[PDB]
Design a protein around this nucleic acid. Structure first.
Lengths: 82, 98, 80, 149, 25, 129, 208, 195
RNA sequence: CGCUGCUGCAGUUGAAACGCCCGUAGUUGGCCCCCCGCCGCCACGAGGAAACGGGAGCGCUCCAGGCAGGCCCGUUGGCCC
RNA sequence: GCGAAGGCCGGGGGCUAGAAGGCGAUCAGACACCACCGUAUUCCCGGCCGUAAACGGUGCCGCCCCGCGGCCGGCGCGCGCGUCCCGCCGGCCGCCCAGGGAAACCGGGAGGCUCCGGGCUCUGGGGGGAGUAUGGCCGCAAGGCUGAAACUUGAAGGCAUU
């Protein structure tokens, strides 16, 4: 990722996360944006497995209210929780 | 500024409405903008209703009601307190209050 | 639900207008129907507005309507 | 949008994807072409010839069953309308409003509809004259329209 | 209605002016 | 009347991205819109585009990955000299390195960067960044 | 320094470091101390001060409005606004707000890609009231081509090359400065093909 | 993972019956309509919601950092029982404007993730949570705005028995998913949660 | 001065949508055939005055200049418009 | 070609209101408002006129565009089945998330526009002078349509807030 310089080393600086659902860069002042994590579980003795898939949703997505449907959809297509 | 979306009138899909006159002022007012409060009252006041009801020699006749649609011009309505000047916030309310 | 486009729901497509659809298609069909006098089946449009006469009883079997043609005599159902 | 009105409506006809003849239908191209020819003997207009084939016979689409449209069948037999039906139907309407106007001189609304209908007859005639489906000599006037119908 | 009253005043001047031009033809 | 098919298609593409949807349907299919989508797909702005056969004028379902900011059409198709393919770049797109103007040329409908190397000039179809 | 917000505690702790990692997580900063901890820059300039009045039974009541732009000379810009009955107090509120809204600037190349980033990363657009601003990437020799107020914001930003176009009542400094700030603030949310690749313990607020 | 005889659990809860107005965002969770007008949710979709809220819940490391809010009087006993089982801070009645955006608010708080009983009267909590990057998880009936609500749980929210039960099913799973309590076994009847 | 707006203005209330409808010029036209004929189009050609402008070389003491100069490409005075 | 009202012309008609006129009360003065009487008018037929805050102060055709309603006219679906229910198309609308805008607000646009280019017409370019002068065309007239300049001036105006 990053804006590479002619020498082949990224110059840029901080790299913003992109919202999982709509791929709009989460901006520095996107205070509304949140990045919750869903816990994978074992077959039986369901327990936190020490690794959480990480999912980001920007505030514009949040305002639409689409995050809840997109979040459910995101797990089912990606498997993971659903 | 435009005070009301309605424009003070209920004209929708029309260019002209039938004129009516203020009952008090006699100003010609398009039917859409008239205040139009219908009233169903009693032929005599309640204070006289008891005495008239006792007076009648007929077996079961109630004081017969009077039905009139009062239509008022805007000025006649605000002066006679039929309608009140409200705040920009409450101006939107449409339900008959009180 | 992951329901998407290019492969859409048939029931959902029917409710949508014939031309506002991925493929604009007829909303009308042909009807196999059987008259009281004659047991042979006459194929008729579902929305015939034309006066249509039975091949048997002289009177027309088609009553024209705003949508689907109503019938006056005996009725069969579902053309095959 | 309607040419002469501020009205928007869509009530079209949706031809099927299949351009091939239906299985239940038992009419050969000659069988329906014969019906088209006898319907021309009755004088029925091609819009009605197409409707009659659709409902009394089961040929909902003529071009699917045959290889050509009703007027192509007629033109091959040289039995097509001399004045294309669309113009002719407008001309009937223009004379019908004009007849009513002769009795009533105060129907300004009726007069207005005449200007719109007449304007279509002129517009369709210029296209028909350019295509040569109409003789170039043809002119729709108005007073002489009664004879033209 | 000062605009409607200005137009009427303009008209009663233009008619006077039109009369004056007519005296000299 | 529907004079510019491309404009309607590209505004629908950009409106669907602004809400954020995975598939959009374009009401009229034109071989020029199909080529425009292809140039964008090769560059990676968009994904698969599917042309449903209406048997009338056809439709297109374009899959949106979410990376397109503004895609537009310059109407009238104006005539761009080769010594002006650079003038259009600064007026229309953001940064010389990012963004693509498609211009039709006798050689074909190609992005400006390719045309600039070929030393050719054509007629602009539209800007996708 | 007494920290209050989780970030304020972590910054003093050294658990959370570099403003760039708080901007990545897009979190608000509620204490100017966090900006002071990150930046030991010895640049803060008050861009104009304006007297404002409210008619009352007495008459006009004068308060002053001050706008201060503070910028680490390269990569982060902050513009802040504040009010009070005396100008000095208002300048403090505006300057503490200016730090409490310090934002990153992407800074890319006009096309001379080689060493240091010299220009805005793409066309930058900002709108405050009527004022609408466009910052255009420019060749290295060509400098900051802008009006003296919007040029100060660009120096404090450290964008060496920029062609700026300002349209509106640009005479309103609050709006002109705001519009350039808005353009620079959104520089880090526009997708470019170089950020098209994809990607809990790493999270900044995960620390608990 | 719906079990056997919900008739004495979620169907006894009346969690399925929702409201007479349906939001577009709640259409998937809802199924059929009764002639009187009520819309009835689908219970396995609510099980897939119960475990899903639990997944975000077992992600946060300190449960007291997670908070839970309600303004509904019937809700008070339920949130408190949820506070007794999982150790999560309570926010009874008014959330208080500026609780999350004013340091000078005497109770300035910063919950890692928020839980709101409904977007009907616990709406301020969802608005403020947006300003400070705080996720929102909420139980929702059919007429529910999902604006700023990151995850939603179809939940009657009308019956006190339904509000309490939703929480008991939710509370059991988060303890079972952390593993702190046993899982997949034969405990309190949610009647303690309901008031 | 984007207060003339091709780029690039504005017209609900700041100035400004004709009261409406038909309508000729004018302007604008859905999708559609891979292969050429004429277009426009675009690329590069020739061929076209210098001055000027841009530009090569050159210390008029610097300079505005001027084509000079140095034992020298066929020493220059190119080349672009 | 049509085009409210007022007006005009040649006839009919003439109840009601009622420009003008007259009048009683006012008030410093009202000749005005208010009361009373009242001519043109109102109304009809045959022509003129060509104007209105002729308004949604929003040209026309085309596209996508977010929910939740009401009404309206067709059409179809379900069910035992009722002017029920769900849709579809077309019209009238309310509220509105984004989006936009100087805001008011608009969102069936005033959105998809400084990130500025779907097509066509019309109009504006600080305030006045002035919609005047003059010429033209048109009308019986009233006037309509077109339409300046000399000259004067630092604001006029929009929408918000105390």
């Amino acid at each position: 990722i990053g804006m590479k310089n002619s020498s082949g080393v990224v110059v840029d600086a901080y790299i913003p996360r992109k919202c999982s659902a709509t791929n709009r860069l989460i901006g520095p002042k996107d205070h509304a944006a949140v990045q919750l994590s869903v816990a994978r579980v074992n077959d039986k003795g369901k327990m936190i497995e020490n690794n959480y898939v990480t999912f980001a949703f920007c505030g514009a997505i949040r305002s639409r209210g689409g995050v809840d449907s997109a979040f459910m959809l995101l797990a089912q297509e990606h498997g993971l929780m659903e | 500024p435009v005070k009301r979306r309605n424009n003070g009138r209920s004209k929708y899909n029309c260019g002209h409405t039938n004129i009516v006159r203020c009952q008090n002022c006699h100003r010609c007012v398009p039917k859409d903008k008239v205040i139009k409060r219908f009233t169903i009252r009693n032929i005599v006041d309640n204070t006289i209703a008891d005495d008239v009801l006792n007076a009648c020699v007929i077996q079961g006749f109630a004081i017969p009601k009077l039905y009139n649609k009062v239509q008022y011009c805007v000025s006649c309505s605000i002066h006679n307190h039929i309608v009140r000047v409200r705040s920009r916030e409450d101006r939107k309310i449409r339900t008959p209050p009180k | 639900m992951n329901v998407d486009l290019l492969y859409p729901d048939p029931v959902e497509e029917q409710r949508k207008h014939k031309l506002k659809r991925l493929v604009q298609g007829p909303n009308s069909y042909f009807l196999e129907i059987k008259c009281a006098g004659c047991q042979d089946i006459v194929v008729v449009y579902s929305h015939a507005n034309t006066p249509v006469f039975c091949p048997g009883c002289t009177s027309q079997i088609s009553i024209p309507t705003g949508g689907k043609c109503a019938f006056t005599s005996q009725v069969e159902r579902y053309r095959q | 949008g309607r040419m002469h009105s501020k009205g928007k409506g869509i009530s079209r006809s949706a031809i099927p994807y299949t351009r091939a003849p239906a299985p239940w239908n038992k009419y050969t191209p000659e069988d329906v072409c014969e019906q088209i020819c006898k319907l021309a003997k009755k004088g029925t207009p091609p819009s009605r010839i197409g409707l009659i084939l659709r409902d009394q016979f089961a040929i909902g689409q003529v071009k699917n069953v045959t290889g050509s449209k009703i007027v192509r069948i007629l033109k091959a037999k040289g039995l097509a309308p001399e004045i294309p039906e669309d113009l002719y139907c407008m001309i009937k309407k223009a004379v019908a409003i004009r007849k009513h106007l002769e009795r009533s001189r105060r129907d300004k609304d009726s007069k207005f509809r005449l200007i719109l209908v007449e304007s279509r007859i002129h517009r369709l005639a210029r296209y028909y004259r350019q295509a040569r489906r109409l003789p170039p000599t043809f002119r729709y006037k108005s007073d002489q329209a009664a004879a033209l119908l | 209605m000062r605009a409607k009253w200005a137009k009427k005043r303009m008209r009663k001047l233009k008619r006077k002016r039109r009369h004056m031009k007519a005296r000299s033809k | 009347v529907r004079i510019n098919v491309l404009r309607d298609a590209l505004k629908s593409i950009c409106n669907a991205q602004r809400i954020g949807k995975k598939q959009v349907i374009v009401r009229p299919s034109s071989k020029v819109i199909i080529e425009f989508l292809q140039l964008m797909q090769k560059n990676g702005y968009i994904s698969d585009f599917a042309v449903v056969d209406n048997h009338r004028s056809n439709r297109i379902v374009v899959n949106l990955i979410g990376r397109l900011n503004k895609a537009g059409v310059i109407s009238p198709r104006f005539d761009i000299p080769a010594n002006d393919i650079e003038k259009w770049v600064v007026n229309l797109l953001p940064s010389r390195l990012f963004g693509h103007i498609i211009l039709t040329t006798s050689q074909g409908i190609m992005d400006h960067i390719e045309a600039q190397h070929r030393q050719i000039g054509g007629k602009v179809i539209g800007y996708f960044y | 320094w007494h920290p209050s917000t989780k970030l304020g505690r972590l910054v003093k702790a050294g658990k959370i470091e570099s403003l760039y990692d708080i901007f990545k997580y897009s979190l608000p900063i509620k204490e100017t101390e966090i900006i002071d901890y990150f930046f030991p820059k010895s640049a803060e300039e008050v861009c104009n001060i304006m007297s404002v009045q409210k008619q009352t039974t007495a008459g006009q009541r004068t308060r002053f409005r001050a706008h201060v732009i503070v910028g680490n000379r390269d990569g982060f810009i902050g513009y802040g606004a504040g009010v009070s009955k005396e100008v000095a107090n208002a300048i403090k509120k505006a300057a503490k707000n200016a730090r409490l809204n310090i934002v990153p600037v992407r800074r890319g190349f006009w096309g001379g890609k080689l060493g240091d980033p010299h220009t805005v990363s793409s066309k930058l657009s900002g709108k405050c009231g009527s004022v609408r601003v466009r910052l255009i990437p420019a060749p290295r020799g060509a400098g900051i081509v802008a009006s003296p107020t919007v040029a100060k914001v660009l120096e404090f930003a450290g964008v060496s090359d920029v062609f700026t176009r300002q349209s509106g009542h640009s005479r309103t400094l609050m709006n002109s400065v705001g519009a350039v700030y808005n353009a620079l603030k959104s520089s880090y949310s526009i997708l470019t093909p170089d950020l098209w690749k994809k990607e809990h313990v790493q999270d900044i607020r995960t620390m608990s | 993972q719906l079990k056997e005889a919900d008739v004495k659990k979620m169907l006894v809860a009346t969690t399925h019956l929702g409201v007479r107005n349906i939001d577009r965002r709640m259409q998937f969770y809802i199924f059929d309509r009764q002639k009187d007008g009520t819309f009835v949710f689908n219970l396995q979709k609510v099980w897939a919601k119960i475990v899903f809220a639990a997944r975000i819940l077992v992600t946060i490391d300190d449960p007291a950092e997670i908070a839970v809010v309600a303004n509904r009087p019937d809700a008070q006993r339920a949130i408190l029982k949820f506070c007794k089982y999982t150790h999560a801070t309570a926010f009874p009645g008014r959330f208080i404007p500026g609780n999350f955006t004013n340091r000078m608010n005497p109770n300035y708080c910063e919950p890692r993730l928020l839980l709101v009983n409904d977007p009907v009267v616990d709406r301020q909590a969802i608005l403020e949570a947006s300003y400070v990057n705080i996720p929102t998880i909420s139980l929702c009936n059919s007429d529910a705005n999902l604006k700023f609500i990151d995850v939603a749980i179809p939940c009657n929210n009308k019956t006190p028995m339904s509000i309490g039960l939703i929480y008991w099913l939710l509370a059991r799973e988060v303890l079972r998913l952390k593993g702190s309590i046993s899982r997949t076994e034969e405990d309190v009847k949610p009647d303690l949660f309901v008031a």
